[PDB]
Amino acid sequence: AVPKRRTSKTRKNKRRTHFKISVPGMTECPNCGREYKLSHRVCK
Amino acid sequence: MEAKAVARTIRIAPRKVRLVLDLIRGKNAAEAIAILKLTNKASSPVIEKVLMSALANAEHNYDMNTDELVVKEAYANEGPTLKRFRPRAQGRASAINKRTSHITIVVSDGKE
Amino acid sequence: VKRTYQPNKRKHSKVHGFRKRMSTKNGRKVLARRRRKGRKVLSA
Amino acid sequence: RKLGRTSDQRKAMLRDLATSLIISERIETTEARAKEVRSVVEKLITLGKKGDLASRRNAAKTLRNVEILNEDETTQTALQKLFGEIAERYTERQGGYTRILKQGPRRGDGAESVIIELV
RNA sequence: AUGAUGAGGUUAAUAGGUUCGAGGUGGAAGCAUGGUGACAUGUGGAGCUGACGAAUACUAAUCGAUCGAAGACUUAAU
RNA sequence: GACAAUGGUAGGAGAGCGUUCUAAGGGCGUUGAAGCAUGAUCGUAAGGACAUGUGGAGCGCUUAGAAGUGAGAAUGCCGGUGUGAGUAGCGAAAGACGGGUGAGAAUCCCGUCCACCGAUUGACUAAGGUUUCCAGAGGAAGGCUCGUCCGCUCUGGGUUAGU
RNA sequence: ACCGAUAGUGAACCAGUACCGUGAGGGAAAGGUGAAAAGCACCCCGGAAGGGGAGUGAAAUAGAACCUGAAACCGUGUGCU
RNA sequence: GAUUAAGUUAUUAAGGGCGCACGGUGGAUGCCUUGGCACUAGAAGCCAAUGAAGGACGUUACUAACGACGAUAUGCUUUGGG
Ligand SMILES: [Mg+2]
Ligand SMILES: [Mg+2]
Ligand SMILES: [Mg+2]
Ligand SMILES: [Mg+2]
Ligand SMILES: [Mg+2]
Ligand SMILES: [Mg+2]
Ligand SMILES: [Mg+2]
Ligand SMILES: [Mg+2]
Ligand SMILES: [Mg+2]
Ligand SMILES: [Mg+2]
Ligand SMILES: [Mg+2]
Ligand SMILES: [Mg+2]
Ligand SMILES: [Mg+2]
Ligand SMILES: [Mg+2]
Ligand SMILES: [Mg+2]
Ligand SMILES: [Mg+2]
Ligand SMILES: [Mg+2]
Ligand SMILES: [Mg+2]
Ligand SMILES: [Mg+2]
Ligand SMILES: [Mg+2]
Ligand SMILES: [Mg+2]
Ligand SMILES: [Mg+2]
Ligand SMILES: [Mg+2]
Ligand SMILES: [Mg+2]
Ligand SMILES: [Mg+2]
Ligand SMILES: [Mg+2]
Ligand SMILES: [Mg+2]
Ligand SMILES: [Mg+2]
Ligand SMILES: [Mg+2]
Ligand SMILES: [Mg+2]
Ligand SMILES: [Mg+2]
Ligand SMILES: [Mg+2]
Ligand SMILES: [Mg+2]
Ligand SMILES: [Mg+2]
Ligand SMILES: [Mg+2]
Ligand SMILES: [Mg+2]
Ligand SMILES: [Mg+2]
Ligand SMILES: [Mg+2]
Ligand SMILES: [Mg+2]
Ligand SMILES: [Mn+2]
Ligand SMILES: [Mn+2]
Ligand SMILES: [Mn+2]
Ligand SMILES: [Mn+2]
Ligand SMILES: [Mn+2]
Ligand SMILES: [Mn+2]
Ligand SMILES: [Mn+2]
Ligand SMILES: [Mn+2]
Ligand SMILES: [Mn+2]
Ligand SMILES: [Mn+2]
Ligand SMILES: [Mn+2]
Ligand SMILES: [Mn+2]
Ligand SMILES: [Mn+2]
Ligand SMILES: [Mn+2]
Ligand SMILES: [Mn+2]
Ligand SMILES: [Mn+2]
Ligand SMILES: [Mn+2]
Ligand SMILES: [Mn+2]
Ligand SMILES: [Mn+2]
Ligand SMILES: [Mn+2]
Ligand SMILES: [Mn+2]
Ligand SMILES: [Mn+2]
Ligand SMILES: [Mn+2]
Ligand SMILES: [Mn+2]
Ligand SMILES: [Mn+2]
Ligand SMILES: [Mn+2]
Ligand SMILES: [Mn+2]
Ligand SMILES: [Mn+2]
Ligand SMILES: [Mn+2]
Ligand SMILES: [Mn+2]
Ligand SMILES: [Mn+2]
Ligand SMILES: [Mn+2]
Ligand SMILES: [Mn+2]
Ligand SMILES: [Mn+2]
Numbered sequence: 001a002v003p004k005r006r007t008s009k010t011r012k013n014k015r016r017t018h019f020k021i022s023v024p025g026m027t028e029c030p031n032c033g034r035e036y037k038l039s040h041r042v043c044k
Numbered sequence: 045m046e047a048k049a050v051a052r053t054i055r056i057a058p059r060k061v062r063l064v065l066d067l068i069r070g071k072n073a074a075e076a077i078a079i080l081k082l083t084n085k086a087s088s089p090v091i092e093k094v095l096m097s098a099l100a101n102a103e104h105n106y107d108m109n110t111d112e113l114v115v116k117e118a119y120a121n122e123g124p125t126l127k128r129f130r131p132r133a134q135g136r137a138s139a140i141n142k143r144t145s146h147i148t149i150v151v152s153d154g155k156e
Numbered sequence: 157v158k159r160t161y162q163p164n165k166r167k168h169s170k171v172h173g174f175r176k177r178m179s180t181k182n183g184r185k186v187l188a189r190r191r192r193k194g195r196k197v198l199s200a
Numbered sequence: 201r202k203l204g205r206t207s208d209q210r211k212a213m214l215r216d217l218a219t220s221l222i223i224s225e226r227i228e229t230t231e232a233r234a235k236e237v238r239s240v241v242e243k244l245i246t247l248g249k250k251g252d253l254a255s256r257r258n259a260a261k262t263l264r265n266v267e268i269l270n271e272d273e274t275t276q277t278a279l280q281k282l283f284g285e286i287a288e289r290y291t292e293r294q295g296g297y298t299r300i301l302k303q304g305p306r307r308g309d310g311a312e313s314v315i316i317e318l319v
Numbered sequence: 320a321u322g323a324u325g326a327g328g329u330u331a332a333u334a335g336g337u338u339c340g341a342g343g344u345g346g347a348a349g350c351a352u353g354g355u356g357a358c359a360u361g362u363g364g365a366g367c368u369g370a371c372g373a374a375u376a377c378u379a380a381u382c383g384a385u386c387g388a389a390g391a392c393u394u395a396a397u
Numbered sequence: 398g399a400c401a402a403u404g405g406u407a408g409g410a411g412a413g414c415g416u417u418c419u420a421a422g423g424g425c426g427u428u429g430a431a432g433c434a435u436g437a438u439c440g441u442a443a444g445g446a447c448a449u450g451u452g453g454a455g456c457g458c459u460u461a462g463a464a465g466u467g468a469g470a471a472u473g474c475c476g477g478u479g480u481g482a483g484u485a486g487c488g489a490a491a492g493a494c495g496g497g498u499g500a501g502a503a504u505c506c507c508g509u510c511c512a513c514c515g516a517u518u519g520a521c522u523a524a525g526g527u528u529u530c531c532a533g534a535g536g537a538a539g540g541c542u543c544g545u546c547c548g549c550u551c552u553g554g555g556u557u558a559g560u
Numbered sequence: 561a562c563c564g565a566u567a568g569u570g571a572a573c574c575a576g577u578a579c580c581g582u583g584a585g586g587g588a589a590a591g592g593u594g595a596a597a598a599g600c601a602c603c604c605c606g607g608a609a610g611g612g613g614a615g616u617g618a619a620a621u622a623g624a625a626c627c628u629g630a631a632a633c634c635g636u637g638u639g640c641u
Numbered sequence: 642g643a644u645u646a647a648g649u650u651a652u653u654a655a656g657g658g659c660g661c662a663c664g665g666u667g668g669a670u671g672c673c674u675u676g677g678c679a680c681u682a683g684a685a686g687c688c689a690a691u692g693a694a695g696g697a698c699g700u701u702a703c704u705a706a707c708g709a710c711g712a713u714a715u716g717c718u719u720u721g722g723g
Contacts, residue, residue, distance in 0.1 A: 013657070035082065050610075101604060101605065101612040121634070163524085164525080219510075308504065
């Protein structure tokens with residue numbers, strides 16, 4: 001089984017509308033000026 | 045005025061770089077710096093280095109207020125693609141694209 | 157599976173080297189053709 | 201109960217990890233192995249708190265064969281470390297001799313990373 | 320499968336540990352005894368015990384961020 | 398000014414458009430040629446100008462001459478670049494942690510433990526290969542990931558026979 | 561009234577060469593910065609690669625993968641939808 | 642009360658489409674010529690045991706490759722040119 005006709009620019013783009021890393025959960029870090037993942041450790 | 049820096053011919057595929065870049069775009073410089081630091085994709089350190097350099101020559105070369113900046117724009121473009129191949133069964137070999145990307149970043153402020 | 161071509165310096169030299177070439181009129185014709193062509197390498 | 205690999209490998213792996221955590225008294229690993237190990241290490245510590253020779257041999261059943269574990273000058277083997285300063289340290293404690301701290305993602309495999317220490 | 324669904328997230332029993340249990344196994348180790356011994360008996364339904372039941376904040380569910388209303392027009396009726 | 402005729406495949410006939418070169422004539426051009434790009438311009442067609450941008454040398458017009466004179470199709474040839482798709486694959490197998498190094502470490506070094514082969518995954522050598530051996534550097538590319546490492550890169554150096 | 565880099569020799573470039581075959585044999589691709597190397601001192605981010613200034617230059621929106629730089633194809637912004 | 646009732650309409654764009662703007666890849670197009678191609682006219686038509694054709698290996702201060710040259714080696718003598 002192989003594609004019978006080629007995907008259009010536009011088809012392939014509608015296909016990828018869900019294909020994206022989303023913004024990480026992040027929070028105001030140790031009062032050390034850092035920035036860290038939610039629920040993950042401050043680091044020195 | 046509002047400043048720019050480019051990382052030309054990086055060995056990451058543009059389809060991949062664009063993923064992080066889309067997170068970064070239009071964000072304030074601090075947020076974007078963070079998101080770059082905490083994002084788990086491979087492009088992140090690279091785009092980190094580039095937003096950083098763009099900010100640096102934004103300060104030294106235009107005496108810009110490094111706090112008030114925004115990521116005016118950011119994007120990757122197709123670079124030259126080094127072409128390799130892997131051997132396959134029955135002696136045939138198949139094409140492989142080691143793609144590269146021109147990452148570009150532009151910090152800004154009060155436009156006029 | 158053993159392939160065709162199991163190398164042998166002693167045997168590759170024969171049937172293919174300058175001497176074995178020149179040993180007959182036809183090798184003369186060969187080296188003629190190759191020198192005429194301009195090979196960096198004539199026989200073995 | 202969780203899995204990384206084969207039941208025997210998983211056994212050896214957890215043994216190595218617990219024995220190791222008793223030696224160097226905090227370690228870094230995947231969140232998964234951390235969450236599995238905390239069970240085992242805590243159970244070894246309770247055997248140690250018990251003190252009877254039965255439970256010492258039971259401890260020996262799982263714990264890895266050796267350490268230098270010397271500190272100031274020679275001595276304590278893991279097991280002995282377990283029934284020694286370790287056990288005495290926690291005798292007044294309720295449960296939970298272990299905490300898991302989240303490092304966040306590792307580089308090459310993008311594994312979640314965590315530190316597991318013992319207080 | 321993933322996501323989705325549901326139980327919870329300190330004013331907390333959501334999982335781990337801890338203490339009891341249920342069920343499963345069948346009599347731990349050490350010792351004492353009887354044997355020339357292999358072994359047997361006692362201590363003692365012993366010891367061990369994933370997922371099943373309870374109790375307990377001892378470890379971890381931290382701080383935090385984002386999303387989300389101010390209600391169009393006409394006509395009839397109060 | 399009338400009045401007729403003007404669908405069309407194989408095919409016959411006719412008039413023309415454009416490309417290259419030549420000849421003669423006459424012209425444009427660093428105050429910016431060709432080419433390229435855009436435009437809402439012109440002729441009945443093939444097609445022709447004009448303006449702005451780019452570009453930084455060469456070009457048109459007229460009459461005639463001659464042709465490697467016009468492409469969308471040959472599972473045509475070459476080059477590039479898509480689709481498939483972030484899909485398949487990543488080549489039999491046990492690793493875990495501590496300590497180093499480093500810009501960066503699942504992957505390098507050291508250590509401890511664990512594991513695998515053990516008529517062999519050990520040892521020595523014939524063919525064949527022909528510097529891959531060594532040491533100190535290195536990390537673009539090769540390595541199916543990563544790389545500080547390498548049978549990769551640079552620099553230097555290594556094979557000693559009367560029996 | 562021959563070619564002008566898929567053309568003209570296979571070969572405008574150290575071609576009968578990379579490469580391919582036991583061998584006879586087969587047999588490529590690859591021309592162009594600028595007038596002048598004046599080939600970007602110096603400062604800035606970065607380990608580097610790369611890049612922003614500052615400069616050379618008529619021009620580097622001529623920067624070495626360098627004249628022009630079409631199309632396929634890939635991206636950012638959006639007016640109408 | 643915009644309350645009640647009936648009816649009619651809009652905004653949304655996760656993403657897509659057309660138009661445009663700015664880029665990237667790529668190397669067509671133009672311009673160019675170091676090389677070819679087909680002929681003209683004239684020289685020339687053989688070299689070798691006095692060891693050729695073509696090679697191999699060497700020679701430069703540093704030397705991998707081509708060319709030159711050869712243990713007198715990136716050249717020596719000699720006569721003329723310059
Ligand atoms: Mg896409
Ligand atoms: Mg492809
Ligand atoms: Mg030889
Ligand atoms: Mg797996
Ligand atoms: Mg228990
Ligand atoms: Mg405690
Ligand atoms: Mg619900
Ligand atoms: Mg309570
Ligand atoms: Mg007795
Ligand atoms: Mg004109
Ligand atoms: Mg036009
Ligand atoms: Mg357009
Ligand atoms: Mg014309
Ligand atoms: Mg004309
Ligand atoms: Mg004519
Ligand atoms: Mg075709
Ligand atoms: Mg996926
Ligand atoms: Mg699929
Ligand atoms: Mg080291
Ligand atoms: Mg080193
Ligand atoms: Mg360090
Ligand atoms: Mg063997
Ligand atoms: Mg082997
Ligand atoms: Mg290093
Ligand atoms: Mg090395
Ligand atoms: Mg080896
Ligand atoms: Mg050619
Ligand atoms: Mg053959
Ligand atoms: Mg400049
Ligand atoms: Mg430049
Ligand atoms: Mg190019
Ligand atoms: Mg384009
Ligand atoms: Mg819109
Ligand atoms: Mg869009
Ligand atoms: Mg209504
Ligand atoms: Mg969107
Ligand atoms: Mg003649
Ligand atoms: Mg003779
Ligand atoms: Mg000769
Ligand atoms: Mn998209
Ligand atoms: Mn094969
Ligand atoms: Mn087994
Ligand atoms: Mn909260
Ligand atoms: Mn109405
Ligand atoms: Mn007709
Ligand atoms: Mn008619
Ligand atoms: Mn005709
Ligand atoms: Mn022309
Ligand atoms: Mn123009
Ligand atoms: Mn003109
Ligand atoms: Mn004509
Ligand atoms: Mn033609
Ligand atoms: Mn994947
Ligand atoms: Mn699948
Ligand atoms: Mn897979
Ligand atoms: Mn493998
Ligand atoms: Mn090791
Ligand atoms: Mn074994
Ligand atoms: Mn055997
Ligand atoms: Mn071997
Ligand atoms: Mn040999
Ligand atoms: Mn080596
Ligand atoms: Mn790699
Ligand atoms: Mn001797
Ligand atoms: Mn060309
Ligand atoms: Mn060969
Ligand atoms: Mn030049
Ligand atoms: Mn620096
Ligand atoms: Mn530089
Ligand atoms: Mn200048
Ligand atoms: Mn030019
Ligand atoms: Mn160019
Ligand atoms: Mn003779």
